[PDB]
C-alpha cells in the first residue's frame, strides 16, 4: 500500500518541481544582469530538485 | 544568501574533517584485527566437541 502512495507522492513532487522550473526561469529572464541572475542561483543552490 | 554562503564555508570544513587520507586503510586494519580474533575464537569453539 505504501508503494502505491509513493507513486502518487512521486507525481506530486514532479508537479512541485515543474512549477519551480517555471518560476525559476521567469526570475532569471527578469533580472536582466549576470550579477542579478547569479544571486538568484545562490539562493536556490541547495533547492535544485 | 549570507546564511547560504555560511553553509558553503561549513561544507568545506565538514569534508576536510570527516574525510581523511587513507581513511579506508585504517578501517581495513581494524577489520583484519577483528577477523584474526574471530578466527582464534572459532578454533576454540571447534575444540570443545572434540
Using an 8 Å CB-CB cutoff, list residues of chain A that contact chain B: 39, 42-43, 45-46
User: Cα dist. A35→A28, A31, B30 in Å?
Assistant: 11, 9, 51
How far apart are the C-alpha atoms of A48 and A46, rounded to whole Å?
6
Resolution in Å, one decimal place: 4.5
Surface-to-core class of residue B1, CB atoms within 10 Å of its CB (0-12 exposed, 13-18 middle, 19+ buried) = exposed
Nearest 5 degrees, angle CA A36-CA A38-CA A40? 75
CB contact under 8 A, A39 and B7: no
Asked if B50 has any chain A CB less than 8 Å from its own CB, the reply is: no
The dihedral over CA atoms of B15, B16, B22, B27, expressed in degrees to the nearest 10, equals -60
Nearest-10 Cα torsion for A16, A17, A23, A24: 150
B41 grid coordinates: 575464537
- For residue A39, the chain B residues in CB contact (below 8 A) are 1
Amino acid at each position: 500500500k505504501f508503494d502505491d502512495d509513493f507513486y502518487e507522492f512521486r507525481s506530486k513532487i514532479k508537479e512541485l518541481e515543474r512549477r519551480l522550473a517555471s518560476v525559476i526561469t521567469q526570475g532569471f529572464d527578469d533580472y536582466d544582469t549576470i550579477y542579478g541572475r547569479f544571486k538568484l542561483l545562490d539562493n536556490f543552490e541547495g533547492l535544485l530538485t | 544568501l549570507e546564511t547560504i554562503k555560511k553553509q558553503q564555508e561549513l561544507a568545506k570544513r565538514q569534508v576536510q574533517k570527516d574525510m581523511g587520507s587513507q581513511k579506508e586503510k585504517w578501517e581495513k586494519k581494524k577489520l583484519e584485527m577483528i577477523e584474526t580474533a574471530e578466527a582464534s575464537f572459532h578454533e576454540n569453539l571447534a575444540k570443545n566437541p572434540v
